[PDB]
Design a protein around this ligand. Sequence first.
Ligand SMILES: Nc1ncnc2c1ncn2[C@@H]1O[C@H](COP(=O)(O)OP(=O)(O)OP(O)(O)=S)[C@@H](O)[C@H]1O
Ligand SMILES: [Mg+2]
Ligand SMILES: [Zn+2]
Ligand SMILES: [Zn+2]
Lengths: 121, 111, 105, 396, 124
Amino acid sequence: EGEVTELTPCETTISHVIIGLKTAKGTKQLKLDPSIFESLQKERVEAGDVIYIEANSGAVKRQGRCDTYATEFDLEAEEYVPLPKGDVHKKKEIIQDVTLHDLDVANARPQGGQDILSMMG
Amino acid sequence: ETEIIEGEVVEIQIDRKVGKLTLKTTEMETIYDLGTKMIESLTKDKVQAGDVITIDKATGKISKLGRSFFVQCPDGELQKRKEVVHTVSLHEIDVINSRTQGFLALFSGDT
Amino acid sequence: RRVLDRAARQRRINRQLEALENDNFQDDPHAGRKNFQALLEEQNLSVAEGPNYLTACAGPPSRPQRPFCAVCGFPSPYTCVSCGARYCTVRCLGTHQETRCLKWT
Amino acid sequence: MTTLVLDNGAYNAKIGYSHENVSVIPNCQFRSKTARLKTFTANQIDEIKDPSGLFYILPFQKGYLVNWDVQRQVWDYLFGKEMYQVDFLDTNIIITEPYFNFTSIQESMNEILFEEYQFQAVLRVNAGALSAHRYFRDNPSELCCIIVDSGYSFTHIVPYCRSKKKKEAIIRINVGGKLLTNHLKEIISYRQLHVMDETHVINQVKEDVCYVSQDFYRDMDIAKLKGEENTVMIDYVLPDFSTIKKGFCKPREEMVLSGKYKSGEQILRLANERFAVPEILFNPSDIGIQEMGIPEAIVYSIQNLPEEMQPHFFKNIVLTGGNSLFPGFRDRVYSEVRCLTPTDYDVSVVLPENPITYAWEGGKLISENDDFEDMVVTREDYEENGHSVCEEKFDI
Amino acid sequence: ITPGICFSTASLVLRATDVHPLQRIDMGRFDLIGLEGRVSRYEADTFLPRHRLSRRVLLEVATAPDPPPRPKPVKMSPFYLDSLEEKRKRQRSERLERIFQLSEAHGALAPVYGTEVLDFCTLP
Ligand SMILES: Nc1ncnc2c1ncn2[C@@H]1O[C@H](COP(=O)(O)OP(=O)(O)OP(O)(O)=S)[C@@H](O)[C@H]1O
Ligand SMILES: [Mg+2]
Ligand SMILES: [Zn+2]
Ligand SMILES: [Zn+2]
């Protein structure tokens, strides 16, 4: 998690994506699986945006722009968010309770899918 | 809390993207440097000089409430910080979060 | 109202910034040798010719400039149309128009 | 025999002998309307009793020595029978120079020092070199350091190796105490009362009330308030030099919200200028200077240098100069550099007890070394080889 | 022609179902229906049990130098820091362990039916 300071795909197609995330406690350079580049492009991630990336799934959520760039324009339709406080890499060991019905309903219908039948569903 | 910009449009300029927007009240006049998203919002909803509009700054929600030269131009400050209070029922929360575009079910049944 | 071109705004900004380097604002109470520009022009200092005074100047900041009110200093959402000065309230706009807009009083 | 250490700054001259303490004396002449025909030189400003409307005759413009007559007079007063009684023919002088000093100024320095005074030997260095020497003497295990010299007329950021100055990575920010004082004058004159002729008093006000904010916009919101909650707002009583010799801040318990006081004291109320003025050091673009601030310039200077040396530079940030005495300066610099520095690299920012006299202590230390005689340039060698070898030996 | 209905609600309502990733488990370890049409019986039953990576192989490949360049076709320490390097090698070990754990997790599930069964059973 952090503000994006650099987003550079490395061509061999793309072998990997090098990203730079900034927080109050420093800067970290990360090598991303090339499949995450599609997620980053879909989320419209640019330098100065505050994002988080899931290590296990590659999911990207762009949760606004950094408030340090709030004065770059006098009127933009943007949601400006503070810079994250902790480290870029956050680890948490959690215990979550689920029921068998939750697993049943998760497998009743497909999720996502870029096909036309999936989108119409 | 939200920031609400209500005024009369004086001049709107968009060039191949960068743009400027000039808004006035009965007490003050200002020129704004526009971003890409606000430029897109102002292009989608046709805004020309003389229109009295209100803008929600965070969302680009532009609603034209008439033309002035018919509604009188706003008087006080152009940019106002407003406190908006919503009372939302539990059913409304459930329906909005039931599915994508699920709020439509609040009006057409189909829950 | 009248409108000032980019040259006038840049000249005003340069004049204000240069005035901050002045030794004194008044004149000599007694009322009765070079300067920095003469030193620079005598040095014949060229860019990219190794480290020097010109190449040591700090580059533009990455973070965007933050607007502040030219009257009271608090953050200013508004920009004056005539001269481009920033301001934050109707009272501040009136004060700016009376004091420093157009003619520089 | 003896060695004289001089830090010929644009605002204060740190002059002293190697075997003695350090003295801080203004390096400029003064004229006042209370004296018809009388020009004050150096520390003679203490003699005047009404420093209002004081006129400054400076030997430095934009941080470089450009007026030679006033500088010569100040040096003659400092070296005269009244101050130090310097025996020029048997004394060595360590005098500091601005960064990237022009060739003409260096020639004039060499000529004046070796002919008009005829010093035995001269060592012309930069204040950062002496600060780095002092830091390395204090910390023998460190191989690199980065020096921030936020002074009167500029703020340089120079990285130093053990015995070499990285000339490629020197970055100058054209914001100094002079600019901050003039900006404070302009703000006060435009907002409350005309003080453009009160440079001394406004400088004291800046030294007394200004501070660096950890949270800029929270402080702005607090200052915008009215009443008890406006903790930032304070009342300053300017000195009239009749019954109030020196300026002071009214106690918070004694503050009056209305601003009207029965006593006829000329009270200057400062709310947002407390941290707006110091912020120009960190954000030059606030007032209109399109230059990177101190933390960003530190990061840029370090990152220009090779990768292997970067963590050492990040571990030895040293703050020198008068502007570093602002409250919250060290913490703000540390926070911003930590935000910009890679997480794997540790950040350490050190503010010495007396950043004014750091360079003088470094000069004293380098004078006490047994390698001192090799660094200086003698007059006997000056006669033949001097004008080239002065440039050759000194790493300006 | 009428303008649409503008239904205004609290911004907090739109985040009611949202849960931070550090507060939720990975539900892809129970995703059986997502494997259909993408994962085959060969991958689950024959290939992966034989060609799963091990920690030893992963570490050997990571530590070993880069392979020699593929031949062209023929028609026939003063600034060294110990703490920084210890941190870097700990980070590398953590990265390799994460790679191993994710590779095991992403191929653990076998399809209920599989691509081969569906293709065989799917008439024109
Ligand atoms: N307590 C203080 N708080 C804030 N500023 C201070 C304080 N004391 C001194 N200053 C400022 O420190 C500056 C002078 O610092 P110095 O570094 O000694 O200047 P100088 O080195 O003689 O000139 P340069 O920059 O080396 S050419 C002045 O602008 C003062 O306003
Ligand atoms: Mg100095
Ligand atoms: Zn204002
Ligand atoms: Zn104006």
